[PDB]
Design a protein around this nucleic acid. Structure first.
Ligand SMILES: Nc1nc2c(ncn2[C@H]2C[C@H](O)[C@@H](COP(=O)(O)OP(=O)(O)OP(=O)(O)O)O2)c(=O)[nH]1
Ligand SMILES: Nc1nc2c(ncn2[C@H]2C[C@H](O)[C@@H](COP(=O)(O)OP(=O)(O)OP(=O)(O)O)O2)c(=O)[nH]1
Ligand SMILES: Nc1ncnc2c1ncn2[C@@H]1O[C@H](COP(=O)(O)OP(=O)(O)OP(=O)(O)O)[C@@H](O)[C@H]1O
Ligand SMILES: Nc1ncnc2c1ncn2[C@@H]1O[C@H](COP(=O)(O)OP(=O)(O)OP(=O)(O)O)[C@@H](O)[C@H]1O
Ligand SMILES: [Mg+2]
Ligand SMILES: [Mg+2]
Ligand SMILES: [Zn+2]
Ligand SMILES: [Zn+2]
Lengths: 343, 355
DNA sequence: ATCTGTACATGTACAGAT
DNA sequence: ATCTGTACATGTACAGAT
DNA sequence: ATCTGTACATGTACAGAT
DNA sequence: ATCTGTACATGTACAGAT
């Protein structure tokens, strides 16, 4: 049943091969252009992120997320009044004393659009800009559509901002050494605007990737000399439930896969033992993820996993009516054996 | 008994007062020696410090009176030639190391002799501290310092070559931690450098002064401090295990016996450290080292060790074909002697623990 | 004036002390 | 139970060099 | 600075076994 | 029906060379 759905969602080896080689041609050419032409982003480096590099992309390898990260030393940070995730940056990049996210992104966008016009072997265009968003999105066609988000990022090597001090609550699950080591990694700021044009937002995509590929309380979880768990499969199932619902209902435009990812990070913290995610218990595990997600809807509270005071389900971000609509749609699917999984 | 062994561990536990006093002096001497290696003409310029052994693994027992530190030198143009299929011993082939070269071959005893000479000269300029250099012992790398920081303290300075290439093929089937610490940990550990230290034997055999031996002290240190199958083992939000406690008790059994019986000169603490690495591989679950089962965990370690003695087989954990209990290293008479002494302690309530 | 090897500054796991 | 000294990893300042 | 070579993690695919 | 072993594929870390 759920097993059969996961067979449908599993990517095909041939499809993976053909998408990646086209994606990698385009990204390599873009990363070269940021370097060789003496742009203000010389030194930018590639960091692959998101579901495809975390091995939880479902259905088709048709959406790829790539970070172009740039070290900036002396990056004075001021919290955009009390939001937790949004900051103003202060002190080559002289043409952007506040580093305007909008101004930096636009020049980054301009460069990419120029380089895309010279690619003659791949059918690739730049998607119209979505306001406030941090991405430059590419639309590729090998006959099948593939989109690529190029995400500009500032990389800072100082200790993480104080609003994360209580985040990453992995101590009872991945442990204190893993937590201390992860917080010795840099933190990242991404030109996503708040509601304004100068604000950046923290990104922990690199930390989330590590967690996805090192998710057990036992070191051997899902390795060739350990036992499989069903953590990622539950994430896939929940991503699919939301993807299918978002296709149908325009009322759900405010929801995104990151809400499902955040909710399962909390569930993985609540239920740390690998035996609590036995493959034989896939249905129970999926159902308790559903119940926890519904509890977040009812209480209007889904805290950012790295930034606990930042409520992704606040009234300001998602209207109460949207959350009650999603609650009804999920409650219905749950009570009837998920008919939407058969479409 | 659960409570007998707990009281022994209390006797074994180091005191913070002693730790602080010993380490103040040790760090002063070591730093001064590391700095001297970095100046002017020194062939050892660039050498880096790596703290190793039981004190930095937190399994030193009774007193903080013996510290091990590696002075490691990266060497790039490195070709290795195995010494008679022994797995552990190598010739090194290829520059400040020119005066140690014997046409292509890097001489261990020539390099160690200069290293030792520089150290002895620097120790003579120390006025702060009562510290001298111990008479060289055959079979040992190590320049050993005897510090009389009132109480006696030994510091083994080990000269090491550092190579960043892939580990020598004699290790391909060693480090069998896949069912315990896992494949990602194993791959990450084998991406670290490997180390070569002087063999420095006086056997009179061919290549005597040009043979080196592999050292995995850094890997052992990581394993000691990341020893559980669960990542939270012995952490502040995890459960305590008794793995290190079993190591201390077995170390203590051997030290007490070795103090009394010169018949045991061939045995050393590395033998019990190797044995418990195998035991940790055999019983990988943290629940097989519950602190409530300290007695039986200690007993099963004794029994595994006794079987190694009687069958004359204790494979090096990193180099499986190298047998640390071969007849060529330890006489059958020495093994039967230790076996009876261990059997005796085991069956009469460990009276040697009360001495 | 700028560059850089050396060592201070900061943070916290481990484990003894109280 | 909390308090605390050592070891250690990484970031960053600057005297002396260039 | 840039780039290839190597090793093995993470995956999918499928036949034979269970 | 699931498990197991081999073959096939991409992603990622990092040594060494240029
Ligand atoms: N790697 C990475 N990609 C990000 C990050 N934030 C956003 N992205 C990428 C993938 C997202 O689907 C895409 C759009 O970002 P958002 O959905 O947060 O903002 P947008 O302005 O599109 O509107 P929305 O808030 O969803 O209504 O940009 C981040 O922190 N890291
Ligand atoms: N880092 C490191 N130090 C080592 C190694 N082998 C020996 N040492 C050092 C630290 C020890 O306290 C000291 C012991 O010297 P040896 O192991 O050469 O002793 P030997 O075999 O002569 O006699 P033994 O078996 O101990 O009775 O030398 C090694 O592989 N790595
Ligand atoms: N609202 C957000 N807040 C913070 N980080 C986000 C947000 N949306 C996305 N991200 C980060 O960017 C990554 C890529 O975003 P994207 O929307 O492509 O999701 P994903 O994880 O790749 O999953 P999928 O593409 O399969 O829906 C996320 O995995 C996450 O690290
Ligand atoms: N025979 C050996 N073969 C390989 N490595 C060895 C050998 N003897 C010692 N070593 C390495 O050198 C380190 C220091 O040796 P040493 O004899 O001081 O033991 P130790 O583990 O520090 O314990 P203790 O000093 O308390 O007896 C060991 O921990 C080990 O990594
Ligand atoms: Mg994505
Ligand atoms: Mg020692
Ligand atoms: Zn798993
Ligand atoms: Zn433990």
């Amino acid at each position: 049943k759920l097993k059969k759905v996961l067979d449908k969602l599993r990517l095909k080896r041939k499809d993976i091969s053909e998408a990646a080689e086209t994606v990698n041609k385009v990204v390599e050419r873009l990363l070269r252009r940021m370097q060789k032409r003496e742009s203000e982003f010389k030194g930018v480096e590639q960091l692959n992120t998101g579901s495809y590099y975390e091995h939880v992309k479902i259905s088709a390898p048709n959406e790829f997320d790539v970070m172009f990260k740039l070290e900036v030393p002396r990056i004075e940070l001021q919290e955009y009044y009390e939001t937790g995730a949004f900051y103003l940056v202060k002190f080559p990049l002289s043409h952007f004393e506040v580093l305007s996210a909008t101004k930096m992104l636009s020049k980054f966008r301009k460069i990419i659009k120029e380089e895309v016009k010279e690619i003659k072997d791949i059918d690739v265009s730049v998607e119209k800009e979505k306001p406030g968003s941090p991405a430059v999105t590419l639309l590729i066609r090998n006959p099948e559509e593939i989109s690529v988000d190029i995400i500009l990022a500032l990389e800072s090597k100082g200790s993480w901002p104080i609003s994360t001090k209580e985040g990453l609550p992995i101590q009872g699950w991945l442990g204190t050494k893993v937590r201390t080591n992860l917080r010795r990694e840099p933190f990242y700021l991404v030109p996503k605007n708040a509601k304004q044009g100068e604000t950046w937002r923290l990104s922990f995509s690199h930390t989330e990737k590590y967690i996805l590929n090192n998710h057990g309380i036992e070191k051997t979880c899902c390795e060739s000399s350990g036992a499989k768990c069903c953590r990622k499969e539950c994430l896939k199932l929940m991503k699919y439930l939301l993807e299918q619902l978002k296709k149908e209902f325009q009322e759900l435009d405010a929801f995104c896969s990151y809400h499902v990812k955040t909710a399962i990070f909390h569930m993985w913290t609540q239920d740390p033992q690998d035996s609590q995610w036995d493959p034989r218990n896939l249905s129970s595990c999926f159902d308790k993820l559903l119940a926890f997600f519904l509890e977040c809807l009812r209480t209007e509270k889904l805290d950012h996993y790295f930034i606990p005071k930042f409520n992704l389900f606040s009234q300001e971000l998602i209207d109460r009516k949207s959350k009650e609509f999603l609650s009804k749609k999920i409650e219905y699917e749950r009570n009837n054996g998920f008919p939407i999984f058969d479409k």
